[PDB]
Protein backbone atom coordinates (compact mmCIF):
# COMPACT_ATOMS: atom_id res chain seq x y z
CA UNK A 1 0.00 0.00 0.00
CA UNK A 2 1.26 3.46 -1.01
CA UNK A 3 -0.36 6.62 0.36
CA UNK A 4 0.61 10.28 0.44
CA UNK A 5 1.94 12.11 3.49
CA UNK A 6 6.64 12.78 0.59
CA UNK A 7 5.48 9.35 -0.55
CA UNK A 8 4.99 7.01 2.42
CA UNK A 9 5.28 3.30 1.66
CA UNK A 10 3.50 1.10 4.22
CA UNK A 11 4.15 -2.64 4.53
CA UNK A 12 3.65 -5.38 7.10
CA UNK A 13 7.19 -6.58 7.81
CA UNK A 14 8.68 -9.26 10.09
CA UNK A 15 11.29 -8.21 12.68
CA UNK A 16 14.66 -9.91 12.35
CA UNK A 17 14.82 -11.30 15.88
CA UNK A 18 12.27 -13.18 17.96
CA UNK A 19 9.36 -15.24 16.62
CA UNK A 20 7.43 -14.04 13.58
CA UNK A 21 5.34 -11.08 14.76
CA UNK A 22 4.85 -8.85 11.70
CA UNK A 23 4.02 -5.19 12.28
CA UNK A 24 3.28 -2.24 10.03
CA UNK A 25 6.39 -0.36 8.89
CA UNK A 26 6.27 3.03 7.16
CA UNK A 27 9.16 4.61 5.29
CA UNK A 28 9.79 7.33 2.72
CA UNK A 29 12.61 9.10 0.85
CA UNK A 30 13.30 6.06 -1.32
CA UNK A 31 16.42 6.26 -3.49
CA UNK A 32 18.75 3.75 -5.16
CA UNK A 33 22.18 3.37 -3.55
CA UNK A 34 23.04 0.18 -5.45
CA UNK A 35 21.94 -2.16 -8.19
CA UNK A 36 23.00 -5.53 -9.55
CA UNK A 37 21.89 -8.84 -10.99
CA UNK A 38 20.94 -9.98 -7.47
CA UNK A 39 18.27 -7.28 -7.30
CA UNK A 40 18.03 -3.66 -6.14
CA UNK A 41 19.31 -1.86 -3.04
CA UNK A 42 17.38 1.16 -1.76
CA UNK A 43 17.79 3.78 0.94
CA UNK A 44 14.79 4.78 3.02
CA UNK A 45 13.79 6.87 6.01
CA UNK A 46 11.68 5.12 8.63
CA UNK A 47 8.64 7.31 9.31
CA UNK A 48 8.48 6.53 13.04
CA UNK A 49 12.11 6.82 14.11
CA UNK A 50 13.47 8.75 11.13
CA UNK A 51 16.46 6.42 11.04
CA UNK A 52 17.97 5.68 7.64
CA UNK A 53 17.82 2.09 6.42
CA UNK A 54 18.93 0.09 3.39
CA UNK A 55 16.48 -2.23 1.63
CA UNK A 56 18.11 -5.04 -0.34
CA UNK A 57 15.52 -6.42 -2.76
CA UNK A 58 16.26 -9.84 -4.28
CA UNK A 59 14.42 -12.70 -6.01
CA UNK A 60 14.89 -15.44 -3.40
CA UNK A 61 13.44 -18.26 -5.50
CA UNK A 62 16.16 -19.64 -7.79
CA UNK A 63 18.33 -22.69 -8.40
CA UNK A 64 20.94 -21.57 -5.87
CA UNK A 65 20.31 -22.35 -2.21
CA UNK A 66 19.15 -19.01 -0.77
CA UNK A 67 20.26 -19.06 2.87
CA UNK A 68 20.65 -15.29 3.20
CA UNK A 69 17.46 -14.56 5.14
CA UNK A 70 17.79 -17.54 7.48
CA UNK A 71 21.46 -16.83 8.25
CA UNK A 72 20.91 -13.13 8.95
CA UNK A 73 17.98 -13.79 11.29
CA UNK A 74 20.33 -15.70 13.61
CA UNK A 75 22.99 -12.96 13.67
CA UNK A 76 23.18 -10.30 16.39
CA UNK A 77 26.62 -8.72 16.64
CA UNK A 78 27.96 -5.18 16.81
CA UNK A 79 30.25 -5.74 13.80
CA UNK A 80 27.55 -7.38 11.64
CA UNK A 81 24.94 -5.21 9.94
CA UNK A 82 21.60 -5.69 11.68
CA UNK A 83 18.52 -6.97 9.86
CA UNK A 84 15.67 -4.79 11.13
CA UNK A 85 12.78 -6.32 9.17
CA UNK A 86 12.06 -8.40 6.08
CA UNK A 87 9.01 -8.56 3.83
CA UNK A 88 7.83 -9.77 0.43
CA UNK A 89 6.54 -7.78 -2.53
CA UNK A 90 6.13 -7.84 -6.29
CA UNK A 91 9.30 -7.12 -8.25
CA UNK A 92 10.19 -5.85 -11.70
CA UNK A 93 9.46 -9.27 -13.21
CA UNK A 94 5.68 -9.71 -13.21
CA UNK A 95 4.18 -12.52 -11.08
CA UNK A 96 7.48 -13.01 -9.22
CA UNK A 97 8.24 -13.03 -5.49
CA UNK A 98 10.97 -10.67 -4.28
CA UNK A 99 12.40 -10.69 -0.75
CA UNK A 100 13.04 -7.34 0.93
CA UNK A 101 15.73 -7.04 3.62
CA UNK A 102 15.66 -3.91 5.78
CA UNK A 103 19.11 -3.37 7.30
CA UNK A 104 20.83 -0.56 9.18
CA UNK A 105 22.17 1.95 6.67
CA UNK A 106 25.95 2.45 6.73
CA UNK A 107 27.41 5.27 4.60
CA UNK A 108 30.87 3.96 3.62
CA UNK A 109 32.91 0.82 3.00
CA UNK A 110 36.52 -0.20 3.58
CA UNK A 111 36.98 -0.31 -0.20
CA UNK A 112 35.71 3.25 -0.69
CA UNK A 113 37.86 4.61 2.14
CA UNK A 114 40.90 2.69 0.89
CA UNK A 115 40.37 3.88 -2.70
CA UNK A 116 40.55 7.50 -1.52
CA UNK A 117 44.01 6.96 -0.03
CA UNK A 118 45.08 5.17 -3.21
CA UNK A 119 43.85 8.12 -5.31
CA UNK A 120 45.54 10.62 -2.98
CA UNK A 121 48.74 8.52 -3.10
CA UNK A 122 48.73 8.43 0.72
CA UNK A 123 48.74 5.34 2.92
CA UNK A 124 45.89 4.35 5.21
CA UNK A 125 47.01 5.12 8.80
CA UNK A 126 47.84 1.96 10.72
CA UNK A 127 45.37 2.85 13.49
CA UNK A 128 42.54 2.46 10.99
CA UNK A 129 44.14 -0.76 9.71
CA UNK A 130 44.15 -2.11 13.27
CA UNK A 131 40.61 -0.89 13.96
CA UNK A 132 39.09 -2.20 10.73
CA UNK A 133 40.95 -5.53 10.73
CA UNK A 134 40.19 -6.13 14.42
CA UNK A 135 36.45 -5.63 14.01
CA UNK A 136 36.32 -7.90 10.96
CA UNK A 137 37.97 -10.71 12.94
CA UNK A 138 35.44 -10.24 15.74
CA UNK A 139 32.59 -10.60 13.24
CA UNK A 140 34.24 -13.68 11.72
CA UNK A 141 34.75 -15.16 15.19
CA UNK A 142 31.05 -14.63 15.89
CA UNK A 143 29.73 -16.18 12.67
CA UNK A 144 32.27 -19.02 12.74
CA UNK A 145 31.16 -19.88 16.29
CA UNK A 146 27.78 -20.77 14.77
CA UNK A 147 29.48 -22.80 12.03
CA UNK A 148 28.63 -20.19 9.39
CA UNK A 149 31.13 -19.26 6.68
CA UNK A 150 30.77 -15.90 4.92
CA UNK A 151 32.52 -17.08 1.71
CA UNK A 152 32.65 -13.55 0.22
CA UNK A 153 34.99 -11.56 2.49
CA UNK A 154 36.37 -8.51 0.67
CA UNK A 155 36.62 -4.72 1.17
CA UNK A 156 33.35 -3.96 -0.66
CA UNK A 157 31.49 -6.05 1.95
CA UNK A 158 32.95 -4.16 4.94
CA UNK A 159 30.72 -1.19 5.72
CA UNK A 160 32.17 1.77 7.59
CA UNK A 161 30.85 4.59 9.73
CA UNK A 162 33.84 6.96 9.41
CA UNK A 163 32.61 9.07 12.34
CA UNK A 164 32.60 6.18 14.82
CA UNK A 165 35.13 3.97 12.96
CA UNK A 166 32.71 1.06 13.43
CA UNK A 167 32.94 -1.73 10.86
CA UNK A 168 29.88 -3.76 9.87
CA UNK A 169 30.12 -6.99 7.88
CA UNK A 170 27.38 -7.53 5.30
CA UNK A 171 26.52 -9.37 2.05
CA UNK A 172 25.55 -12.77 3.42
CA UNK A 173 24.26 -13.90 0.01
CA UNK A 174 27.14 -16.39 -0.27
CA UNK A 175 27.36 -17.54 3.36
CA UNK A 176 26.71 -21.17 4.27
CA UNK A 177 26.57 -23.35 7.38
CA UNK A 178 29.53 -25.56 6.49
CA UNK A 179 29.01 -29.21 7.44
CA UNK A 180 32.07 -31.41 7.98
CA UNK A 181 31.70 -34.08 5.32
CA UNK A 182 29.25 -32.33 2.97
CA UNK A 183 30.73 -30.98 -0.28
CA UNK A 184 30.41 -27.29 -1.15
CA UNK A 185 30.65 -25.13 -4.26
CA UNK A 186 34.25 -24.24 -5.14
CA UNK A 187 33.50 -20.95 -6.95
CA UNK A 188 32.23 -19.14 -3.89
CA UNK A 189 34.58 -16.19 -3.27
CA UNK A 190 35.41 -13.12 -5.38
CA UNK A 191 38.39 -12.30 -7.57
CA UNK A 192 41.63 -11.51 -5.67
CA UNK A 193 40.20 -12.99 -2.42
CA UNK A 194 39.74 -16.72 -3.10
CA UNK A 195 41.86 -19.00 -0.93
CA UNK A 196 44.19 -21.36 -2.83
CA UNK A 197 42.10 -24.41 -1.85
CA UNK A 198 39.14 -22.74 -3.57
CA UNK A 199 41.27 -21.98 -6.64
CA UNK A 200 42.30 -25.66 -6.80
CA UNK A 201 38.62 -26.62 -7.02
CA UNK A 202 38.33 -27.98 -3.48
CA UNK A 203 34.79 -28.80 -2.35
CA UNK A 204 35.72 -29.81 1.23
CA UNK A 205 37.04 -26.48 2.48
CA UNK A 206 36.23 -24.91 5.85
CA UNK A 207 35.64 -21.51 7.46
CA UNK A 208 39.38 -20.80 7.16
CA UNK A 209 38.77 -19.49 3.63
CA UNK A 210 37.36 -16.39 5.35
CA UNK A 211 40.67 -15.99 7.19
CA UNK A 212 42.54 -16.05 3.87
CA UNK A 213 40.23 -13.35 2.51
CA UNK A 214 40.90 -11.28 5.64
CA UNK A 215 44.63 -11.60 4.97
CA UNK A 216 44.04 -10.41 1.41
CA UNK A 217 42.18 -7.40 2.80
CA UNK A 218 44.95 -6.75 5.33
CA UNK A 219 47.65 -6.87 2.66
CA UNK A 220 45.53 -4.69 0.36
CA UNK A 221 45.22 -2.02 3.06
CA UNK A 222 48.98 -2.12 3.70
CA UNK A 223 49.75 -2.22 -0.03
CA UNK A 224 47.34 0.24 -1.66
CA UNK A 225 46.15 -2.37 -4.17
CA UNK A 226 45.13 -6.04 -4.25
CA UNK A 227 48.02 -8.38 -3.54
CA UNK A 228 46.84 -11.30 -5.74
CA UNK A 229 45.15 -9.79 -8.81
CA UNK A 230 44.38 -11.72 -11.98
CA UNK A 231 41.40 -12.52 -14.18
CA UNK A 232 41.67 -16.31 -13.93
CA UNK A 233 42.42 -18.81 -11.19
CA UNK A 234 45.79 -19.61 -12.73
CA UNK A 235 46.60 -15.88 -12.84
CA UNK A 236 45.76 -15.40 -9.15
CA UNK A 237 47.53 -18.64 -8.20
CA UNK A 238 50.67 -17.44 -10.00
CA UNK A 239 50.52 -14.24 -7.93
CA UNK A 240 50.23 -16.30 -4.73
CA UNK A 241 53.10 -18.63 -5.64
CA UNK A 242 55.24 -15.65 -6.61
CA UNK A 243 54.85 -14.36 -3.02
CA UNK A 244 54.43 -17.53 -0.93
CA UNK A 245 56.64 -19.72 -3.13
CA UNK A 246 55.67 -23.05 -4.61
CA UNK A 247 53.51 -25.03 -2.15
CA UNK A 248 54.93 -28.28 -0.86
CA UNK A 249 53.36 -31.65 -1.60
CA UNK A 250 51.94 -31.79 1.92
CA UNK A 251 50.59 -28.24 1.53
CA UNK A 252 48.97 -29.20 -1.79
CA UNK A 253 47.40 -32.26 -0.15
CA UNK A 254 45.97 -29.98 2.55
CA UNK A 255 44.23 -27.95 -0.18
CA UNK A 256 43.22 -30.55 -2.78
CA UNK A 257 44.71 -34.07 -2.95
CA UNK A 258 43.97 -34.31 -6.69
CA UNK A 259 47.05 -32.15 -7.46
CA UNK A 260 49.67 -33.94 -5.34
CA UNK A 261 51.25 -35.81 -8.27
CA UNK A 262 51.96 -32.89 -10.63
CA UNK A 263 55.48 -31.49 -11.06
CA UNK A 264 55.04 -27.80 -10.36
CA UNK A 265 58.24 -25.77 -10.87
CA UNK A 266 59.83 -24.71 -7.60
CA UNK A 267 59.59 -20.92 -7.24
CA UNK A 268 61.41 -19.29 -4.34
CA UNK A 269 59.31 -17.42 -1.79
CA UNK A 270 59.47 -13.63 -1.69
CA UNK A 271 60.13 -12.35 1.86
CA UNK A 272 57.16 -10.60 3.44
CA UNK A 273 59.23 -7.58 4.46
CA UNK A 274 60.03 -7.00 0.78
CA UNK A 275 56.39 -7.38 -0.28
CA UNK A 276 55.22 -4.32 1.66
CA UNK A 277 56.76 -0.87 1.99
CA UNK A 278 59.75 -0.33 4.32
CA UNK A 279 57.55 1.71 6.69
CA UNK A 280 55.25 -1.27 7.27
CA UNK A 281 54.99 -2.26 10.97
CA UNK A 282 56.70 -5.59 11.74
CA UNK A 283 53.67 -6.92 13.62
CA UNK A 284 51.42 -6.29 10.62
CA UNK A 285 53.79 -8.37 8.51
CA UNK A 286 53.83 -11.02 11.24
CA UNK A 287 50.03 -11.15 11.36
CA UNK A 288 49.83 -11.27 7.56
CA UNK A 289 52.11 -14.31 7.29
CA UNK A 290 49.95 -16.21 9.80
CA UNK A 291 46.82 -15.44 7.73
CA UNK A 292 48.00 -16.12 4.16
CA UNK A 293 49.09 -19.73 4.71
CA UNK A 294 48.80 -22.54 2.17
CA UNK A 295 47.61 -25.15 4.67
CA UNK A 296 44.12 -24.09 5.85
CA UNK A 297 44.60 -25.41 9.39
CA UNK A 298 47.80 -23.36 9.80
CA UNK A 299 45.98 -20.04 9.37
CA UNK A 300 45.06 -18.23 12.57
CA UNK A 301 41.52 -18.49 13.84
CA UNK A 302 39.61 -15.17 13.93
CA UNK A 303 39.70 -15.19 17.73
CA UNK A 304 43.45 -15.85 17.69
CA UNK A 305 43.94 -12.96 15.25
CA UNK A 306 42.27 -10.48 17.63
CA UNK A 307 44.82 -11.50 20.28
CA UNK A 308 47.72 -10.74 17.91
CA UNK A 309 50.27 -8.16 19.01
CA UNK A 310 49.39 -6.01 15.97
CA UNK A 311 46.16 -5.08 17.79
CA UNK A 312 47.94 -4.25 21.07
CA UNK A 313 47.47 -0.53 20.40
CA UNK A 314 43.68 -0.91 20.43
CA UNK A 315 43.89 -2.48 23.91
CA UNK A 316 45.72 0.60 25.21
CA UNK A 317 43.50 2.41 27.75
CA UNK A 318 44.56 5.84 26.42
CA UNK A 319 43.98 5.05 22.73
CA UNK A 320 41.88 7.63 20.88
CA UNK A 321 40.66 8.13 17.33
CA UNK A 322 42.37 10.65 15.03
CA UNK A 323 39.26 12.86 15.16
CA UNK A 324 39.25 12.85 18.98
CA UNK A 325 36.43 10.43 19.78
CA UNK A 326 36.97 7.36 21.93
CA UNK A 327 37.31 4.07 20.08
CA UNK A 328 34.25 1.90 19.40
CA UNK A 329 33.27 -1.12 21.47
CA UNK A 330 36.13 -3.61 21.25
CA UNK A 331 36.21 -5.74 24.43
CA UNK A 332 32.52 -6.60 24.97
CA UNK A 333 33.05 -10.27 24.15
CA UNK A 334 30.25 -12.74 24.82
CA UNK A 335 30.84 -16.33 25.88
CA UNK A 336 29.36 -17.40 22.53
CA UNK A 337 32.06 -15.68 20.48
CA UNK A 338 34.69 -16.75 23.04
CA UNK A 339 33.67 -20.41 22.73
CA UNK A 340 36.54 -21.53 20.50
CA UNK A 341 39.21 -20.36 22.99
CA UNK A 342 37.87 -19.03 26.31
CA UNK A 343 41.39 -18.60 27.79
CA UNK A 344 42.06 -15.92 25.15
CA UNK A 345 39.93 -13.53 27.24
CA UNK A 346 43.05 -12.89 29.34
CA UNK A 347 44.57 -11.08 26.35
CA UNK A 348 41.40 -10.06 24.50
CA UNK A 349 39.93 -8.13 27.45
CA UNK A 350 42.53 -5.70 28.86
CA UNK A 351 42.47 -5.21 32.65
CA UNK A 352 41.01 -1.70 32.36
CA UNK A 353 38.09 -2.89 30.21
CA UNK A 354 36.60 -4.92 33.10
CA UNK A 355 34.41 -2.88 35.45
Amino acid sequence: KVSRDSKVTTVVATPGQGPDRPQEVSYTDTKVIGNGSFGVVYQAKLCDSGELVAIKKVLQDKRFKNRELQIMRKLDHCNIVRLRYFFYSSGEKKDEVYLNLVLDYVPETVYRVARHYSRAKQTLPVIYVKLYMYQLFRSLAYIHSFGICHRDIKPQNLLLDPDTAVLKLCDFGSAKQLVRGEPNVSYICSRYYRAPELIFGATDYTSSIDVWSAGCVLAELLLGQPIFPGDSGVDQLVEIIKVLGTPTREQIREMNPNYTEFKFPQIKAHPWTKVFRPRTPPEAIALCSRLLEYTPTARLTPLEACAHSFFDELRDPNVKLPNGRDTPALFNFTTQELSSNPPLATILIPPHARH
Partner: peptide, 19 residues
Protein backbone atom coordinates in the same frame (compact mmCIF):
# COMPACT_ATOMS: atom_id res chain seq x y z
CA UNK B 1 38.11 -27.54 -13.85
CA UNK B 2 39.89 -30.81 -14.61
CA UNK B 3 43.12 -31.08 -12.57
CA UNK B 4 45.12 -32.35 -15.55
CA UNK B 5 44.30 -29.33 -17.72
CA UNK B 6 44.62 -26.88 -14.82
CA UNK B 7 48.01 -28.22 -13.71
CA UNK B 8 49.40 -28.02 -17.26
CA UNK B 9 48.54 -24.33 -17.56
CA UNK B 10 49.97 -23.58 -14.11
CA UNK B 11 53.23 -25.40 -14.90
CA UNK B 12 53.56 -23.54 -18.21
CA UNK B 13 53.03 -20.23 -16.39
CA UNK B 14 55.40 -21.05 -13.52
CA UNK B 15 58.17 -22.12 -15.91
CA UNK B 16 57.99 -18.74 -17.66
CA UNK B 17 58.34 -16.81 -14.39
CA UNK B 18 60.92 -19.17 -12.87
CA UNK B 19 64.50 -17.92 -12.53
Amino acid sequence: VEPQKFAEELIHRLEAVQR
